[PDB]
Amino acid sequence: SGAKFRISLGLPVGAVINCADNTGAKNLYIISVKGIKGRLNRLPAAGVGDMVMATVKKGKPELRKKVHPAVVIRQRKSYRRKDGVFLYFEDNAGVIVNNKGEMKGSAITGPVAKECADLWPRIASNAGSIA
Amino acid sequence: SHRKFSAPRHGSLGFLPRKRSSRHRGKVKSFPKDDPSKPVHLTAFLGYKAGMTHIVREVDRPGSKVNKKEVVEAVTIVETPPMVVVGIVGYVETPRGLRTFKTVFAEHISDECKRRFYKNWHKSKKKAFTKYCKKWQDEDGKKQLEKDFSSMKKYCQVIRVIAHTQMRLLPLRQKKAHLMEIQVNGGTVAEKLDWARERLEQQVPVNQVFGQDEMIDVIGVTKGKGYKGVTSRWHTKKLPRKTHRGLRKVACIGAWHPARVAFSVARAGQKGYHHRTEINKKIYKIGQGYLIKDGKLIKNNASTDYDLSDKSINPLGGFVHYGEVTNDFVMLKGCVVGTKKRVLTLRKSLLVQTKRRALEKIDLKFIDTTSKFGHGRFQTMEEKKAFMGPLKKDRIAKEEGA
RNA sequence: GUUCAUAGCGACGUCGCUUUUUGAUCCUUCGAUGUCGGCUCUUCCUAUCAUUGUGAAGCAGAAUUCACCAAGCGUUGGAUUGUUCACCCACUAAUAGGGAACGUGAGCUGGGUUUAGACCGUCGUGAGACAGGUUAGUUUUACCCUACUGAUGAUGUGUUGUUGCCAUGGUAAUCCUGCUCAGUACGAGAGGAACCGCAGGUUCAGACAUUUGGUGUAUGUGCUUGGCUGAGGAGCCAAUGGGGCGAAGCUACCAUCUGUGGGAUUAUGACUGAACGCCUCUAAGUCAGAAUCCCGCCCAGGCGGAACGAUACGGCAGCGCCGCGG
RNA sequence: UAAACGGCGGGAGUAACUAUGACUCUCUUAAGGUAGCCAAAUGCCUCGUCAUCUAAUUAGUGACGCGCAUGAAGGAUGAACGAGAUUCCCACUGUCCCUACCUACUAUCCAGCGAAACCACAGCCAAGGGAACGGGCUUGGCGGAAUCAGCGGGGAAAGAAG
RNA sequence: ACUGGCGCUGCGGGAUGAACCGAACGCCGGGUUAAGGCGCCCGAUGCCGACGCUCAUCAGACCCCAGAAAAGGUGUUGGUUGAUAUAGACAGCAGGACGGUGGCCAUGGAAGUCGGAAUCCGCUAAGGAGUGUGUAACAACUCACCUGCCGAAUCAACUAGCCC
RNA sequence: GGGCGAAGCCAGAGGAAACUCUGGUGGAGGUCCGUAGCGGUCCUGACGUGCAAAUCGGUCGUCCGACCUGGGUAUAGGGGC
Ligand SMILES: [Mg+2]
Ligand SMILES: [Mg+2]
Ligand SMILES: [Mg+2]
Ligand SMILES: [Mg+2]
Ligand SMILES: [Mg+2]
Ligand SMILES: [Mg+2]
Ligand SMILES: [Mg+2]
Ligand SMILES: [Mg+2]
Ligand SMILES: [Mg+2]
Ligand SMILES: [Mg+2]
Ligand SMILES: [Mg+2]
Ligand SMILES: [Mg+2]
Ligand SMILES: [Mg+2]
Ligand SMILES: [Mg+2]
Ligand SMILES: [Mg+2]
Ligand SMILES: [Mg+2]
Ligand SMILES: [Mg+2]
Ligand SMILES: [Mg+2]
Ligand SMILES: [Mg+2]
Ligand SMILES: [Mg+2]
Ligand SMILES: [Mg+2]
Ligand SMILES: [Mg+2]
Ligand SMILES: [Mg+2]
Ligand SMILES: [Mg+2]
Ligand SMILES: [Mg+2]
Ligand SMILES: [Mg+2]
Ligand SMILES: [Mg+2]
Ligand SMILES: [Mg+2]
Ligand SMILES: [Mg+2]
Ligand SMILES: [Mg+2]
Ligand SMILES: [Mg+2]
Ligand SMILES: [Mg+2]
Ligand SMILES: [Mg+2]
Ligand SMILES: [Mg+2]
Ligand SMILES: [Mg+2]
Ligand SMILES: [Mg+2]
Ligand SMILES: [Mg+2]
Ligand SMILES: [Mg+2]
Ligand SMILES: [Mg+2]
Ligand SMILES: [Mg+2]
Ligand SMILES: [Mg+2]
Ligand SMILES: [Mg+2]
Ligand SMILES: [Mg+2]
Ligand SMILES: [Mg+2]
Ligand SMILES: [Mg+2]
Ligand SMILES: [Mg+2]
Ligand SMILES: [Mg+2]
Ligand SMILES: [Mg+2]
Ligand SMILES: [Mg+2]
Ligand SMILES: [Mg+2]
C-alpha cells in the first residue's frame, strides 16, 4: 500500500481557502481537521491531502450555512517531498467531498498536489493536472 | 484544585542534572555484552565531527511509497583516522562492581599520546612513562610484565585496550590526543589478551571495527548554549504580552504546599554541553581516505557507482569551521550531537538489529559536494570553471603565464 | 427483566464511607494570612473515560453493558458568558472525576465582587438604601534565609595527572490509522472481526542545521530620499534614514535525524493434590501471566573506592627506600 | 394651584365559529397610566419567545408585551458631533498556532564610590500532637567549609495599632 | 447538676499533649514502690516461665486515643441442639423413579413442572397425580424415594473466638 | 501651515414676469486637520526605597475662543469660592 508521509501543514483552523470545484462555492473556511487528536492551545492544522470540515463563506446560498467535508488540494506553504523537492503552490485550494471521499462537484480548476491525488482517487480523476 | 485542562509535561525528567558535562570526550558507560562464541573484536572507536551533507540513493523498502524511488537524505561526516593501541587494562568482577585489576602500557608511547598526561606540555620535561618503558628491556622488568599478563589471564573477566587518536593527521589546532578504553569482546580472556598484546603499538583502522550499512550508537557532548531561560531550556509556553515583570518565565513554580520548589519545575540555567547517547545511527559509507601510489587519490571519497566523478568528500571550499578531511571517514545517516570538530564516540549497538530499517543494504547514487559556505551551486572546481569559462583574473594570469 | 429475584436493575426497609456541595459551630487569625475567575506550571488521588491484561452477559459477529488487577500514559480546538458551572459546534482512543490555604496576585491579568464620580428602577418626607441593573475607576518591595535551578569549590588518598568503577538519586516513551488476514470466521440475512506481518502518522522526548524557512548592524553589496564636504570621484549625518538581496552564526514538526531489553509477579486461567475413601487452581507443591512494579538502556556521580604515570639541584638541595640505626 | 412635591387600583357579565373584551355592574380611589416606548443604562422570573447574524452566540440587531418595578418639563424622535458604552463586517497584522533572531541600555565582571527596608533567636523535611496548617517539640528521614548568577514555593515575608 | 481537676502545678507513665493514670514539690544520700514497663533505641525477663488462639498479596499490638458498621467465609478453633448408622450409615460408582392419569379447572400445547384447589389408591424396593433443566408441545434428563457394590462412623442447623 | 467655503458682489445663459441655472469673486464660523500653548485618553507602558511625596515615553483632546497667560487687586474658616 503506502501511507502519506508527514508534510508541513500551514493551514490552521480558521483559514479561508479557495474552492477549486464547480459546486458554486467560492471559498472554504476550515473549522477543523480530520484525525487531529490535539494538544493544549495547539490549533488543528491541515496540509494537502487532508480531509477537513469546512463551511463556505461566500458562494451559492444553499451551501453557506452548513458544514461540509473538504480535502485540501493545494497549499501555499512549502513542503518537502522525500526527494529534496520543496514545493509550494500559488494559492490554498480545496474541493468539497463527502465522507466517502468522492467530490460533490465534477471538475477541478488548477493543479492538484500529487500527495492529495494519490490519497484520493476520486479527486485525482477530476484533476486537470497533478503537480 | 485540579488544573482545568490536561497537558503533558514540558521536558523529560530522565536528563535532570541539566548541567555542563564533567567530560569533553563522552564516555561509553555500557559496552556490548560479551559472548565468547564471537571472534575477538573491538566495540568502539573515536571520530571527529567534520560536517554534514546530503546524498541521493534508491530505497529498497517493499510496501512503501518510496520503494524503488530516489530520496535525498542528510548525512554526517565523521573523520576517523586509525586508533593506536598503547595499553591493556584488565578488570575483575567483585560484589562491589568491576574494579581495575592491572594496567600494562606498551613501549614507545606516541608523542601526541603523551601530551594527554600534561596540563602544560610546553613547560614539561616530557618525563612521562620514561622509567616505565625501561622495564620492557631488562629481564627483571620483562619477567614482571609476563606475570602481569598471566595474572590478567587467570583473574580478569573483561579486558580493555587503551587507544588514542592521531592529532597530527587532523586539520585541528589541538595536538593532544584523545585516550580511550575500548572493550575487547568475543572470546576467552586468554584469547583476547593474546589478540590485544599483538595490537600493542599498532594502528587499528575504523573498517576493522565497524562495517558498511550497520547501525551504531553515537556518544558525545552537545553544543553549548550558555545560560538559558525556561522558554529556551524547557520550551515552556510564553506568557502574554501584558505580563508585568516578564513573559519568558514560568508563572507558577509550585503550590503553597509542599512549601518548597520541586525538582520537577522548569527553571533557568545551563543549556547545552550535555552528555548524550543516540542509538541506531546507520553507516551509509566508510570512506577510504587519501592515498599516494603514483598520484594523490581522492575519488574513493565521494565517487559512487553511478557518479564516477573524481571528487573527495570535501565540499567546494572545504568543510566550514572544520578544515579538510583527508583520512578515513564514516558517513552516518542524519544528525549527530556536538559542534564541528567535536570528538565523538562510536559504539557498537547494544541491541539486536532485526527490523527492516536495519539490515538494509545502502547503495549511494550521488554525494553532494557543493560549497556549504553559502548557497553553493557547483559540485567540483572543474565543473565551475567549465560553466563560467575564463575570468578576468585568469586572463591577467595567463598574460603573465605567456 | 417475553419465562427467570440477583446478565443487568432494586421497591419497602436498613448499614456505611467521603469531605470535590451546602449547612451547623466560632477553636486560630481584626498592631491585616491580599478576597472570584481565567492564564501558566508542577505534583498527587482513584471512586478508570481511553489504552495494556483479564472475568461476566439477556456476549453469534460488530457494537454495548457489569466487574477485577491497574493512575504507566493521555483526556483536545472553538461560539456565548467575568464566570466557576452551563450549553452548543467539531475533532477524537477518550474528550473521567477530583486535591494541593475552594494550589498558584513581591507569577500575571483585573473581566467580576467590594471605596470615592454618574445614570435608571424600586424603597424612603429626607439624608440615603438595594446578595437590582449599568458605566468609569493607582494591583507597590526581594539585594535577606531556605527551597529549587545552574556555577566555582571543600574533606581524605604525600603532591599532581591520566584512565576508570559504581553506592546512591533521576528516568520515557505514547497512542492511532491504512494494507494484508478478509467480504474471511460468525450470521438466515443485514452486516462483520482478530493474531502474525508491512507501511505510516499523533502526543512526548533528545538532538541537529545538509536542505527549506526566519533573523541579519559581517553595517557585506547594490538602489534610493533630504542635507553636507565648491563639482566629479569618494564619502558622511538623519538615535539602524529607507529599501532589495545577503555569508557566518543562531534557529522552526516551518527543515531533518533518533527513541531499546529482561526479571519477579497482579488480576486471571490452569497442573498435581489432600483436607472431605468423591471433588477441588491450594492446604503442602507446581505452570502461564500484563500500559503495573524492579532493574537494564539512558542522565548525574559519595566526607566512596581502583589501576597506572611522573614525582622537585648543577648545586649544597630537596626527596624516596633500606637499619627498628642511635 | 401639579412645567409645586408627588400619585395614576381589583373582582364579575358582555361582540352570530371560537378567542379576547370594544362595552357595562359594583368594591375602592383624588384620579385610577392617556400619547408613546420597552427584557431598553429601567424585566426578578430570564440564558423570556420568535426571526436574523455564526459551524456553534448567556453577546448584537429586529419584533412581541398583564411592563417584579416604562411613561410624559419630561415622553418619543432626529442630522452633526464624542480620547463616552456596545455588536458585526472589510482590510490589517507575532494577539495567537509557536516561537525565533537582531539592535541599544541594563543586569553581569572589574577600578572608584556606596545606601535602605527589615532583623526574638534563627533558618533541610515527613508524620504526630499542639491555640485544630511547626524552623525549633516527639518519632523517624538525615546532616559537610566558603560562595557566585538566578528564582519567586515558603518565611501564614515586608509595608499600615484592618 | 455532682465531685474532682486545669486555670494557679512541677514530677513518674500515656512516644508526643493544659485536663488522662500515679503522685503533688525545701537541698541531698540510702532503701522501696505507684501507674507503667522489661527484643534494640531505652533502665529492667539474657525466666531452659505456663496453657492455648492466630497467617493476613491493606495481620495484630494496651484507658482518654487518635479510625469503622450491617452483612458474609466449606480458614481454623471451641460449644449447643438434633439426626442417621453392622436391621449397615455418609460420600463415591450402578439401576427402577410407575398404572389408572396425556389426574380436575384453567386450553390455542401445556401431558408432573405459565397458573387455582385439594395429595387418591395398588405394585411394592420405591416413586411427588411431582424439587428443577428443558421440549412449540410431545419427548429426553434430574431431583425425593428405594435397591446393589462399598464395610466405620457420619450428617445438619446454629452459636462465638482469632483471621479474611 | 493647510481644508470647507456663509452672506455681499460681477459676468454669462434661460425666463412674460416671479425669478432660475452656470462660472468667478468674497472670506463667515464658540468650523475641520494640525504646530506652539493649554489639557491629560489609552498602553491599566516606564518608574514605583523613583529623576519626581504624581514624574517620564509613545499615543492622544483642543488649538479665534465659554482660549492661554504675567503682574496688580477682592473674597478667610462653619467662612470664602
Ligand atoms: Mg488555551
Ligand atoms: Mg484530571
Ligand atoms: Mg501591567
Ligand atoms: Mg552553509
Ligand atoms: Mg418476573
Ligand atoms: Mg474564637
Ligand atoms: Mg502581609
Ligand atoms: Mg503571604
Ligand atoms: Mg480501583
Ligand atoms: Mg485559592
Ligand atoms: Mg504567592
Ligand atoms: Mg500583586
Ligand atoms: Mg473593573
Ligand atoms: Mg462606585
Ligand atoms: Mg419618591
Ligand atoms: Mg477612564
Ligand atoms: Mg547583583
Ligand atoms: Mg537506579
Ligand atoms: Mg514519568
Ligand atoms: Mg543623497
Ligand atoms: Mg557623487
Ligand atoms: Mg554633523
Ligand atoms: Mg535630532
Ligand atoms: Mg531577506
Ligand atoms: Mg521538529
Ligand atoms: Mg484425581
Ligand atoms: Mg492462582
Ligand atoms: Mg511463572
Ligand atoms: Mg388643575
Ligand atoms: Mg402603556
Ligand atoms: Mg419591558
Ligand atoms: Mg439590559
Ligand atoms: Mg463575539
Ligand atoms: Mg431588543
Ligand atoms: Mg405592535
Ligand atoms: Mg513539616
Ligand atoms: Mg485594631
Ligand atoms: Mg485603625
Ligand atoms: Mg487567668
Ligand atoms: Mg488550688
Ligand atoms: Mg499537677
Ligand atoms: Mg510525663
Ligand atoms: Mg499515644
Ligand atoms: Mg532516692
Ligand atoms: Mg517503654
Ligand atoms: Mg537494657
Ligand atoms: Mg474650532
Ligand atoms: Mg479641531
Ligand atoms: Mg485621569
Ligand atoms: Mg502603570
GROMACS .gro file of N, CA and C (backbone and C1' of nucleotides) in nm, chain E residues 37-56:
model
  140
 1058G        P    1   0.213  -0.056   7.989
 1058G      O5'    2   0.364  -0.035   7.943
 1058G      C5'    3   0.452  -0.145   7.928
 1058G      C4'    4   0.589  -0.112   7.980
 1058G      C3'    5   0.694  -0.220   7.965
 1058G      O3'    6   0.753  -0.218   7.837
 1058G      C1'    7   0.700  -0.132   8.184
 1059C        P    8   0.767  -0.352   7.752
 1059C      O5'    9   0.905  -0.414   7.802
 1059C      C5'   10   1.022  -0.335   7.812
 1059C      C4'   11   1.130  -0.408   7.888
 1059C      C3'   12   1.138  -0.557   7.860
 1059C      O3'   13   1.214  -0.585   7.745
 1059C      C1'   14   1.145  -0.518   8.093
 1060G        P   15   1.145  -0.646   7.615
 1060G      O5'   16   1.268  -0.667   7.516
 1060G      C5'   17   1.369  -0.762   7.544
 1060G      C4'   18   1.444  -0.794   7.418
 1060G      C3'   19   1.530  -0.680   7.365
 1060G      O3'   20   1.661  -0.687   7.418
 1060G      C1'   21   1.388  -0.760   7.193
 1061C        P   22   1.721  -0.565   7.503
 1061C      O5'   23   1.759  -0.458   7.393
 1061C      C5'   24   1.865  -0.482   7.302
 1061C      C4'   25   1.866  -0.379   7.192
 1061C      C3'   26   1.842  -0.235   7.235
 1061C      O3'   27   1.955  -0.173   7.291
 1061C      C1'   28   1.709  -0.282   7.048
 1062C        P   29   1.933  -0.058   7.400
 1062C      O5'   30   1.875   0.065   7.316
 1062C      C5'   31   1.954   0.127   7.216
 1062C      C4'   32   1.875   0.225   7.134
 1062C      C3'   33   1.817   0.343   7.207
 1062C      O3'   34   1.912   0.444   7.233
 1062C      C1'   35   1.656   0.255   7.059
 1063C        P   36   1.915   0.516   7.376
 1063C      O5'   37   1.885   0.399   7.479
 1063C      C5'   38   1.893   0.422   7.619
 1063C      C4'   39   1.805   0.328   7.696
 1063C      C3'   40   1.806   0.183   7.650
 1063C      O3'   41   1.794   0.097   7.763
 1063C      C1'   42   1.586   0.267   7.640
 1064G        P   43   1.923   0.060   7.850
 1064G      O5'   44   1.892   0.124   7.993
 1064G      C5'   45   1.972   0.095   8.106
 1064G      C4'   46   1.888   0.073   8.229
 1064G      C3'   47   1.805  -0.054   8.230
 1064G      O3'   48   1.881  -0.162   8.280
 1064G      C1'   49   1.671   0.130   8.294
 1065A        P   50   1.916  -0.287   8.187
 1065A      O5'   51   1.843  -0.407   8.259
 1065A      C5'   52   1.807  -0.399   8.396
 1065A      C4'   53   1.665  -0.440   8.418
 1065A      C3'   54   1.609  -0.541   8.321
 1065A      O3'   55   1.647  -0.674   8.351
 1065A      C1'   56   1.452  -0.368   8.354
 1066U        P   57   1.727  -0.762   8.244
 1066U      O5'   58   1.613  -0.822   8.151
 1066U      C5'   59   1.488  -0.859   8.206
 1066U      C4'   60   1.451  -1.001   8.173
 1066U      C3'   61   1.415  -1.027   8.028
 1066U      O3'   62   1.529  -1.052   7.949
 1066U      C1'   63   1.252  -1.124   8.172
 1067G        P   64   1.527  -1.025   7.791
 1067G      O5'   65   1.583  -1.160   7.729
 1067G      C5'   66   1.722  -1.173   7.700
 1067G      C4'   67   1.780  -1.300   7.757
 1067G      C3'   68   1.756  -1.321   7.905
 1067G      O3'   69   1.766  -1.461   7.932
 1067G      C1'   70   1.985  -1.291   7.869
 1068C        P   71   1.637  -1.545   7.975
 1068C      O5'   72   1.663  -1.577   8.128
 1068C      C5'   73   1.578  -1.525   8.229
 1068C      C4'   74   1.524  -1.634   8.317
 1068C      C3'   75   1.504  -1.767   8.247
 1068C      O3'   76   1.531  -1.875   8.335
 1068C      C1'   77   1.295  -1.685   8.324
 1069C        P   78   1.659  -1.969   8.310
 1069C      O5'   79   1.615  -2.065   8.192
 1069C      C5'   80   1.637  -2.029   8.055
 1069C      C4'   81   1.560  -2.117   7.959
 1069C      C3'   82   1.424  -2.165   8.007
 1069C      O3'   83   1.339  -2.181   7.893
 1069C      C1'   84   1.562  -2.351   7.967
 1070G        P   85   1.241  -2.063   7.846
 1070G      O5'   86   1.117  -2.077   7.944
 1070G      C5'   87   1.061  -1.964   8.008
 1070G      C4'   88   0.975  -2.006   8.124
 1070G      C3'   89   0.840  -2.065   8.087
 1070G      O3'   90   0.847  -2.201   8.050
 1070G      C1'   91   0.809  -1.902   8.252
 1071A        P   92   0.752  -2.255   7.934
 1071A      O5'   93   0.610  -2.270   8.004
 1071A      C5'   94   0.593  -2.353   8.118
 1071A      C4'   95   0.450  -2.354   8.162
 1071A      C3'   96   0.347  -2.369   8.052
 1071A      O3'   97   0.331  -2.503   8.011
 1071A      C1'   98   0.283  -2.193   8.192
 1072C        P   99   0.319  -2.537   7.855
 1072C      O5'  100   0.164  -2.524   7.826
 1072C      C5'  101   0.069  -2.584   7.912
 1072C      C4'  102  -0.068  -2.526   7.891
 1072C      C3'  103  -0.111  -2.507   7.747
 1072C      O3'  104  -0.154  -2.626   7.685
 1072C      C1'  105  -0.165  -2.314   7.872
 1073G        P  106  -0.113  -2.656   7.532
 1073G      O5'  107  -0.171  -2.531   7.453
 1073G      C5'  108  -0.269  -2.547   7.352
 1073G      C4'  109  -0.380  -2.447   7.367
 1073G      C3'  110  -0.414  -2.368   7.242
 1073G      O3'  111  -0.501  -2.439   7.156
 1073G      C1'  112  -0.395  -2.221   7.427
 1074C        P  113  -0.487  -2.425   6.997
 1074C      O5'  114  -0.533  -2.277   6.967
 1074C      C5'  115  -0.668  -2.236   6.985
 1074C      C4'  116  -0.684  -2.092   6.948
 1074C      C3'  117  -0.631  -2.054   6.811
 1074C      O3'  118  -0.721  -2.083   6.707
 1074C      C1'  119  -0.554  -1.899   6.970
 1075U        P  120  -0.666  -2.129   6.564
 1075U      O5'  121  -0.605  -1.997   6.502
 1075U      C5'  122  -0.686  -1.884   6.477
 1075U      C4'  123  -0.601  -1.764   6.443
 1075U      C3'  124  -0.500  -1.784   6.333
 1075U      O3'  125  -0.558  -1.775   6.204
 1075U      C1'  126  -0.397  -1.676   6.515
 1076C        P  127  -0.515  -1.877   6.090
 1076C      O5'  128  -0.407  -1.796   6.007
 1076C      C5'  129  -0.435  -1.665   5.960
 1076C      C4'  130  -0.332  -1.619   5.860
 1076C      C3'  131  -0.281  -1.727   5.766
 1076C      O3'  132  -0.256  -1.671   5.638
 1076C      C1'  133  -0.100  -1.635   5.888
 1077A        P  134  -0.370  -1.671   5.526
 1077A      O5'  135  -0.395  -1.517   5.499
 1077A      C5'  136  -0.286  -1.432   5.466
 1077A      C4'  137  -0.317  -1.288   5.491
 1077A      C3'  138  -0.197  -1.196   5.495
 1077A      O3'  139  -0.159  -1.152   5.365
 1077A      C1'  140  -0.329  -1.159   5.687
   0.00000   0.00000   0.00000
